[model samples]
Target: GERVGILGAGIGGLYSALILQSLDVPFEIIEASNRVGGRLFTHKFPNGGKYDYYDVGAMRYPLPKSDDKGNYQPGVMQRVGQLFTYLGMHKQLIPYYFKSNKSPGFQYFNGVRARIGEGSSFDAPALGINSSLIDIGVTKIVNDAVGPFAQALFDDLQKHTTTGWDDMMKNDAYSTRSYFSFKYLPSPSFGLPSEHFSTRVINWLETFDKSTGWYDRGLTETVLEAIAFGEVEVDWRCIDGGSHVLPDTIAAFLHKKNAFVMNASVTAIGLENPNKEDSPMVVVAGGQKRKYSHVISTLPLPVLRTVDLKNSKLDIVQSNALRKLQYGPSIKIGILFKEPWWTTGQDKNGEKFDLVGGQSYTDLPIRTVVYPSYGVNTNAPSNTLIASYCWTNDAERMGSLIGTGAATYEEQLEHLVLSNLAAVHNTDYQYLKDRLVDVHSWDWNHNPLTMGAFAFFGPGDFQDLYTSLNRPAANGKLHFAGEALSVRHAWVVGALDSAWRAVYNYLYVTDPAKLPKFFELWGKNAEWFEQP
Candidate 1:
């Protein structure tokens, strides 16, 4: 019976805990945050505000589905669907209408109220208000006809998905953006720049940048995210009250059997023997030292890089991944209103833009606005929407406010966001402003615990860094989990999947004689850490 020490009580760490607990193995979870759910943060609004709460991190579960080819597309997520069965969380899922393919797209572009779906005029000259300054400004880029560019992008994406992402990856130059010419897709010209749009488009789908301006995400990866960005289709689903409940429930399940520690930031991880279970690896956390036969670390790669390593056996390839893998940036602003104004809004065509649980994109400082799907029509008293002003220069700009406390931070951000909201809603500026009861925001980039919102790749980062991190560490002392290590980056499915791989790998390293095949324990969907 080997002992396992765990780091971070996020979905990945908790999933690992669940697996070990099922095996009757002894383990402990070390979480640096005061709370257990890491990126699964559900922000509760104080002061008795409307909408009860909002998800600051990881709001919805990207559901499992099939590609047109009949091949299961969401491989990491396929295991996630089964995990839902184990936890009895399948019914907990509700229609999360974040966006759907048939739903009409809405936008407030450059002082013009427009719905950018099917056949809508998106050109600046068509709007009939051509000021040269406006033309010279960002409006010019955003208002410029994007049908061809978007269509071109869609055309290319369809080609990649149907043919195979690997088929495109084969170009010897090793550049997907250059290979397919989506480099400009994330370029400086857009409502949001390419990197932000690249990652922003994919943020839900989610990660990238500067060139695409989705800086952290790379050329090809951005394309995939953009494809899943709901432009082609939307598969929106969410846990009934809050997503944090999923992790909280798991933590409750582990409470009786496993040792769970909060506020225990791991300072170091070093193996005494590196290969033998007899010489336990020592973990320094919360000024206390504990030894374990093996350790599964669910800390993000950037966070892992800062920790002290003592007598480590990880090779150069592994160590470089720990340090060099890029993490992306994000900022979310949630504004609570006293009433459900968005549910009654309209598109520019005068069509009743009444919608629920879907998103409205923008070219403003606030790149996206999402109306909450929870408690729709039945009445939850007030409403809350995410000014999904994240994953780009806009996010970075607003994120700077995290430096200061509430009052002084983001004085103009709310107003800027509100102005955009007025345009989207087709309502009076004062009417929308008066209904606002509360506001909240989070900056994943500035947070000390996690460097960025999620993991994303630049050109060479994923291919080089992903392989080493994705595979279980060869030295056998430390194993990796978290969205960063998985083929899927931003979603919890990736985190959960990585957990299975890490724990499975650990069984082989520690005691293969007793180790059973992974699928038997985790279900048939469980695959190797080296999956595609």
Candidate 2:
């Protein structure tokens, strides 16, 4: 019997393991962390206090339905239905209801509204230019056209990229900024900062939007609303206690089958005897060696590079791709309040609203904030609130929010939340500050194992590297699966979809004749698989 060894215990690994298990294959999962749920972390505020869960990564699911035109439209109600079906549980996925007109609305820069010319929001350009002259000229054009205020914003964005500060401020390449400045910026307001993001990345995101139909009305609502409205059939559900419940549940299932070994950090893999049978063997960091007929690594590409492959030949392109891939730096800040202050309406009106109030309160302190139904589940006690803020690679901006060097992670988080609240809401800082029960923050960039949160592409890399990155290698002995590797980057559905691809590929390679026809249907478009 062929033995399989899997690495990492993230969603990608767990889902792949589940698929392999269903096939009655003998396999073992090697996890580096002491616990499971790679990026899907759930933590509590204030130890021993009523435990309100805070999701550190990948929180919500926007399950959009496929429209008549083949567009994917998010339907909150449909997602809820699917969740109910998947979990076989009867808990209503309620909306985080806010007062009718009080929800904080999204904004674009200047005074530009979200929509353009009537119905359309801005669409990113299909082809991008990175002309040095354009890069230089555009900065001046933007400065002259939109004034120094907007130009300053552009300059700030350039600082985040590999693009030099002077060049970003002065250059006019056919970058994401040029698209926004030339096309979208003229409108007045747009979602997201243009200069901070890469032109290529913006284009990729736009491409995803076009394919996914993200612009639809019902689909545009919050995830909770989409689930409620039946826009999608929720085929997934959070675990009973919390989302972390799913990881624990899968881990337990693996243990009961006696097929998984937790906390095993795989250090290397190669053929045991190159000329003879290609008996793949995995070497754990602790000097323990395990031999297998096949090995499937789910470790992040960067982490996988740390392992030395011996005896067997490795592909230089694949190896270099792993080494060169870049992930964005991210920080997760969890805030636990003594009471659901947003709900108290004590600050605004006694209405259950968001911490940022409505769209009217556009200039809030935090970049992004969400009040997840804290006490709805048993994970948290009643009256406690959980909210999180996400920042991308702007550690310097964060350092300014919380003092640098001297401040600990917790202190920095607290400082950030309190300071932002003071700036956005005209409330007493001491009063709101005192209400904070706990603060948790993780600098994902600093984590050696993760390196960065997840992958993001530069211009052209999406179309170029995407398909190759997902390809199975080593004669189907090695496979890649992650949200980063998915057709849709930085999304949970992409992770799930990628898992299906890896498994389907594996099944085809291992048992070409006997593999189920459904495996062949995996990535086929809905039209291709449908009967005539």
Best by TM-score: 1
- RMSD (Cα, Å) of model 1: 7.4
- Per-model tally of clashing residue pairs: 22, 42
Using all chains and alpha carbons, the TM-scores for the candidates as numbered come to 0.80, 0.67
Query: What is model 2's C-alpha RMSD?
Result: 11.4
Candidate RMSDs in order: 7.4, 11.4
Query: How many residue pairs in model 1 have overlapping backbones?
Result: 22
Model 1, residue 489: displacement in angstroms? 0.3
Worst 10 residues of 1 by lDDT: 203-212
The digit string of per-residue lDDT tens for model 1 on 178-264 reads 432443342334344333223222221211112214623455455445433433334457777687888898998888665987788
TM-score for predicted model 1 compared with the true structure = 0.80
Give me the overall lDDT of model 1. 0.65
- Which regions of candidate 1 are displaced past 4 Å? 48-51, 65-76, 100-105, 116-118, 124-177, 180-212, 223-235, 273-278, 345-353, 471-474, 513-517, 524-532
